[PDB]
Amino acid sequence: CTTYTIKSGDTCYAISQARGISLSDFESWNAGIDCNNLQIGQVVCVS
Ligand SMILES: [Zn+2]
Ligand SMILES: [Zn+2]
Ligand SMILES: [Zn+2]
C-alpha cells in the first residue's frame, strides 16, 4: 500500500479525486475507514 497522512481539511473524496481513483476503490483498501471522522495524522492507503 502507498501511504498518505491525513492533513487539515482533507476528505476521502478529495484524496480519491486527486489521485484519479474511485472512492469505492479507496474504501476497499482502507478497512471500514470512517470518512466522516478522519483525524489529522491518520494514515490511509492510496493504492
Ligand atoms: Zn463508499
Ligand atoms: Zn476500480
Ligand atoms: Zn462516522
Q: Which three cell numbers, joined as nine digits, stand for 46?
A: 492510496
Determination technique for this entry: X-ray
Q: What is the 3-state secondary structure (H, E, C) of 4-47?
A: EECCCCCCHHHHHHHHCCCHHHHHHCCCCCCCCCCCCCCEEECC
- What amino acid occupies position 22? S
Number of domains in the chain: 1
Largest CA distance in the chain: 23
Q: Residues within the annotated binding site for Zn(2+)?
A: 25, 27, 34, 36
Question: Domain limits at 47?
Answer: 1-47
Q: What is the resolution of this structure in A?
A: 1.5
For residue 1, the tally of other CB atoms under 10 A from its CB is 10
Cα–Cα distance measured from residue 12 to residue 44, given in angstroms and rounded to the nearest whole number: 9
Q: Which three cell numbers, joined as nine digits, stand for 18?
A: 486527486
Cα–Cα distance measured from residue 27 to residue 38, given in angstroms and rounded to the nearest whole number: 13
Distance from the alpha carbon of residue 33 to the mean position of ligand 3, in angstroms:
9
CATH of the domain at 8: 3.10.350.10
